[PDB]
Structure 1
């Protein structure tokens, strides 16, 4: 931008663009920590000071050599500052929604915001040279997005805002960035616990905020759904992924889910896992190990993030597509008639399926399943291309 601006000004004479520092001094309206606000119950254990933006994410961890060693770098917003900067950003859209829903503009009703949380670890980032800690080569990004805003009028609630692209890259707002392992528990809790503190604080308050000359009041509902299965197992205090206890919504075993397979009901929640960890830790009936694990249904840790039980959609796509890929590779070998097979027969079935998928569906083969592969794979054209390689026809109609 600097050399574009420099060339445009040095050629055309007049200054069409703006210099860099003007953009700098006009970007501070959009970063957090610019606008005034207050909470009508003042929030527990967070200051009412309203000009804090990019603060350190460690929250003053003891970095001495005499302590538990830390090696991560973390920068974060304050959670209330990020929420108010996002709402003052969406100000104009809120006003237009109140116009278009045949409401007024000057309302100050209790606007209920519904926001969505997401945390996911990244790999293969590279630490640099130079001074600093011995930082790992991963990253954890905690971010949120504002899914919808309703207001109460009369006795019904009308939607003055509803996000059009809920899975876009333009609506998820970053909140905390750190360089630590997803599976390393201690530094993960060390960075993320201030955020949970601010959230459980502001889950019971009324933010008063001036929106175009009028103060208005917002309440909040946080929905944690942007978590993959592995992170829900890790931070909800449940067991690992391959246990007998599979579902993070209901209490059933893996063999029971293959006998009934449909009829369940959602039973797991956050308060239930907290009380079950208390049951496990106290051992109040004096059972053995295995009877206790039956009693607590697999909870063996303290859950420290409240979440909503739900299903991640993208990884459901990828997991079901890989399972169907294994079914296709197991049907061209007729394993229902050859129940024993070598390694190399299975390898050759895989290579045959790869060649025929490239010949028919124009798909190159990959070892890590993607989403575009998952959408191109779950067609009927792919089951025609696979049914070209089965000798039977009962398997044809079953796959169809």
Structure 2
């Protein structure tokens, strides 16, 4: 049969037919042998009422069938933590056992991963962007930015690898092109619409603790690492004068939306190296603050603006990069200049009186000291500013710290009310420990809860119940105290949805209202009924929960959360499974893998099974 002969014999037998077909093609269609052969074969196949095979052939020719586009296989390989050798083994095994090439080779995957890395698509800027090169095909670079590693210089042993800020932003925009197009189509907008697109971006920076992989040989080195990443929060566009949010992130404080800029191995407390590494990024950011990006992603020129907000900084880093003292200062509020002593007296009445410019001014005053005053008065006049700030930060808090602080205060409140201290002026520590033990036993017997000094979120959540306060108040006489505790718990549960909703302007505006009223009522109850807790101690978390909540709400409008061991495990997995040696290409490879992992395109191709 003809199907049993080799291609050579079939060619020798059908040379005349091929010549006739190609000459008809070049005489009628004008050198279109491919299309006419495709159509003739499709008609010959449909001549036997084979519509299933015809549809399968059309799907194969279109490429929407069993093709496994290199993007999909790249996402699979980068998500399942698959190395190159094992992936090639699987590919060749499947190709040999199936016959068809369902997966993709290695060079196709390399092209698919290079088409997504930063420094590929062209762009431009309306301002010249001084002190910034115009080259647009650069990717991973040394984070030291021309270090001074000579022997006669300050020694430093760090490996910093980074992307360029504008390149990373252009790559993220080219990645979310499809998402923003779909969003603007769903928002009832035209397919052709120029900018400017107001892009609000969140900034974050945090360490990774320990990333050492020493199996044995004792604790040789701690080897602390640190990263620096950003996250596009939202995109807005207007039609004339009315604005409309065209893109909003579903999970802002997640792991799959962490776009990394730089990765280095340096301690967070190491100030000089951190400053030397982060100065170029801060310079690029302050130069881009007032620029205009121009891109050609949607076939037409699109203009882009940017608004940066550094809210992803924890307390330990915001008390160091801002110039304030780390932990020994009397000043605790990162927004107000209230001392620890005045905070215990004034509870709610405060305001945000801190900014970057005023911090620079206070540091300049501290350095110059034109009044020639003593050290203590100068310190209390500069409000604890000792170091020069170089990063404009926007501090924020989460609900976890607020609730754990409230629960830690209420625990001691319960101890003080069960110990009958309002009639005993000076008690003993052993008597208070006996009170604590009795309360713990009573709680474990009635509510069946396990007490522990190590406090966390689950303990604070399970302790804040009406049944708990009822069970701990039914033991003490003078039901007036029971009514006081009832009012306190009621005010607490009324204030909880304000910071436990993530959107007070839409979820519960009535809960957001009367906030100052109930806060003043709580302060008056605490200062009159519980006129004993005034021992000169106050927690900064409790102060921020009392006073600086409405201001933060008016500034942003949400609280959210920050999942502690989230990035370190991923970094260790990337460094162990798919990474190179020599400690030079290791950081570049882990950064590239993390960038491919945090890509919205690959994640969208992955989670598409829910549909």
Coarse TM-score class (shorter-chain normalised): 0.7 to 0.9
Query: Would you say the 8 A contact 1:136–1:181 is kept in 2?
Result: no
Q: Distance in 1 between matches of 2:106 and 2:219?
A: 33
Q: Distance in 1 between matches of 2:407 and 2:116?
A: 42
* Residues 373 and 179 (structure 1), Cα distance of their counterparts in 2 relative to 1, 3 Å cut: farther
Shift, 1:65, TM fit: 3.2
Shift, 1:5, TM fit: 3.9
- Structure ID, larger Rg: 2
* Residues 133 and 43 (structure 1), Cα distance of their counterparts in 2 relative to 1, 3 Å cut: farther
Shift, 1:264, TM fit: 1.4
Query: Would you say the 8 A contact 1:244–1:254 is kept in 2?
Result: yes
Match of 2:395 in 1: 309
Shift, 1:159, TM fit: 0.9
Q: Distance in 2 between matches of 1:8 and 1:180?
A: 44
Query: Would you say the 8 A contact 1:72–1:133 is kept in 2?
Result: no
* Residues 209 and 236 (structure 1), Cα distance of their counterparts in 2 relative to 1, 3 Å cut: same
Deviations 1:320-370 (A, max 9, x none): 444444545555555555665666665666666666767777766666544
Query: Would you say the 8 A contact 1:238–1:298 is kept in 2?
Result: yes
Q: Distance in 2 between matches of 1:185 and 1:351?
A: 45
Shift, 1:263, TM fit: 1.3
Which one of the candidate residues 282, 299, 303 is aligned to 1:217?
Answer: 303
Deviations 1:269-288 (A, max 9, x none): 11110111111111122221
**Which moved further from structure 2: 8-17 or 204-213?**
8-17
Query: Would you say the 8 A contact 1:223–1:308 is kept in 2?
Result: yes
- 1:351 partnered with 2:437: yes
Q: Distance in 1 between matches of 2:240 and 2:115?
A: 35
* Residues 133 and 184 (structure 1), Cα distance of their counterparts in 2 relative to 1, 3 Å cut: farther
Deviations 1:115-153 (A, max 9, x none): 111112232332559999997432222221111111132
What SS class does the counterpart of residue 106 from structure 1 fall into? coil
* Residues 94 and 323 (structure 1), Cα distance of their counterparts in 2 relative to 1, 3 Å cut: same
* Residues 374 and 218 (structure 1), Cα distance of their counterparts in 2 relative to 1, 3 Å cut: farther
Deviations 1:147-176 (A, max 9, x none): 111113211221111112122222222222
* Residues 33 and 360 (structure 1), Cα distance of their counterparts in 2 relative to 1, 3 Å cut: farther
What SS class does the counterpart of residue 113 from structure 2 fall into? coil
Deviations 1:196-240 (A, max 9, x none): 111111001001111221111111100111111221111111123
Query: Would you say the 8 A contact 2:323–2:389 is kept in 1?
Result: yes
Query: Would you say the 8 A contact 2:202–2:309 is kept in 1?
Result: yes
* Residues 366 and 76 (structure 1), Cα distance of their counterparts in 2 relative to 1, 3 Å cut: farther
Deviations 1:63-109 (A, max 9, x none): 23322221222222111111111111111121122222222222112
Q: Gaps (5+ residues) in structure 1?
A: none
What SS class does the counterpart of residue 279 from structure 1 fall into? helix
* Residues 155 and 323 (structure 1), Cα distance of their counterparts in 2 relative to 1, 3 Å cut: same
Matches for 1:281-360 after TM superposition, within 5 Å: 281-328=367-414, 332-334=418-420, 336=422
Measured on the aligned residues, the alpha-carbon RMSD in Å equals: 3.3
Query: Would you say the 8 A contact 1:249–1:310 is kept in 2?
Result: no
Q: Distance in 2 between matches of 1:2 and 1:377?
A: 54
Query: Would you say the 8 A contact 1:72–1:136 is kept in 2?
Result: no
Q: Distance in 2 between matches of 1:112 and 1:290?
A: 46
Shift, 1:394, TM fit: 5.3
Query: Would you say the 8 A contact 2:210–2:222 is kept in 1?
Result: no
Q: Distance in 2 between matches of 1:360 and 1:49?
A: 70
Q: Which has a greater percent of helix?
A: 2
Query: Would you say the 8 A contact 1:72–1:134 is kept in 2?
Result: no
Query: Would you say the 8 A contact 2:419–2:435 is kept in 1?
Result: yes
* Residues 375 and 87 (structure 1), Cα distance of their counterparts in 2 relative to 1, 3 Å cut: farther
* Residues 384 and 77 (structure 1), Cα distance of their counterparts in 2 relative to 1, 3 Å cut: farther
**Which moved further from structure 2: 192-201 or 370-379?**
370-379
Deviations 1:2-24 (A, max 9, x none): 55545544444433333444322
Deviations 1:12-61 (A, max 9, x none): 44333334443222112222111111111122322111122222222232
* Residues 355 and 279 (structure 1), Cα distance of their counterparts in 2 relative to 1, 3 Å cut: same
* Residues 69 and 363 (structure 1), Cα distance of their counterparts in 2 relative to 1, 3 Å cut: farther
Matches for 1:96-107 after TM superposition, within 5 Å: 96-107=182-193
Shift, 1:386, TM fit: 5.0
Q: Distance in 1 between matches of 2:127 and 2:461?
A: 49
Query: Would you say the 8 A contact 2:322–2:391 is kept in 1?
Result: yes
How many pairs are equivalent?
A: 400
* Residues 36 and 228 (structure 1), Cα distance of their counterparts in 2 relative to 1, 3 Å cut: same
Query: Would you say the 8 A contact 1:71–1:134 is kept in 2?
Result: no
Q: Gaps (5+ residues) in structure 2?
A: 1-86, 487-611
Query: Would you say the 8 A contact 1:127–1:137 is kept in 2?
Result: no
**Which moved further from structure 2: 345-354 or 239-248?**
345-354
**Which moved further from structure 2: 18-27 or 210-219?**
18-27
Query: Would you say the 8 A contact 2:235–2:247 is kept in 1?
Result: yes
* Residues 132 and 393 (structure 1), Cα distance of their counterparts in 2 relative to 1, 3 Å cut: closer
